[PDB]
């Protein structure tokens, strides 16, 4: 029954990791402006 | 300050901040003395002026 917990914890860490490295990954340069 | 009452009905917020440091606190929680609170306030006021 802990299998559901493992699956949801894995997908939550996956989405959070996408967020963390997406904003670590030179986010302010993703702009059309001169900056 | 009213000394005979427990010290939370007098609308005082930061004398609990000094009293949590135990400065003038009895065994059961009696206030005992108010001079540490007074000297704390005056030192803060002089520091504020400078």
């Amino acid at each position: 029954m802990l299998t559901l917990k493992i699956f949801v914890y894995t997908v939550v860490t996956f989405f959070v990791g996408l967020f963390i490295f997406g904003f670590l990954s030179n986010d302010p340069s993703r702009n059309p402006g001169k900056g | 300050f009213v000394p005979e009452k427990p010290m939370y009905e007098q609308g005082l917020i930061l004398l609990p901040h000094i009293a949590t440091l135990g400065y003038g606190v009895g065994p059961g929680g009696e206030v005992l003395d108010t001079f540490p609170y007074f000297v704390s306030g005056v030192l803060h006021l002089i520091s504020s002026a400078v």
Partner: protein, 44 residues
């Protein structure tokens, strides 16, 4: 007891971890995304 329960509610479990496999797969997923990001860093 009448049913099998996780019985981890409370007890001060860090990050809600009660078995080591969950912490290992959390670290594995974060490390996998980190390896992908690191090898594919500097755009190219």
């Amino acid at each position: 007891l009448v049913d099998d329960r996780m019985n981890g509610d409370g007890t001060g479990l860090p990050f809600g971890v009660n078995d080591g496999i969950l912490g290992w797969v959390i670290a594995g997923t974060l490390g996998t995304i980190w390896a992908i990001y690191f090898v594919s860093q500097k755009d190219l």
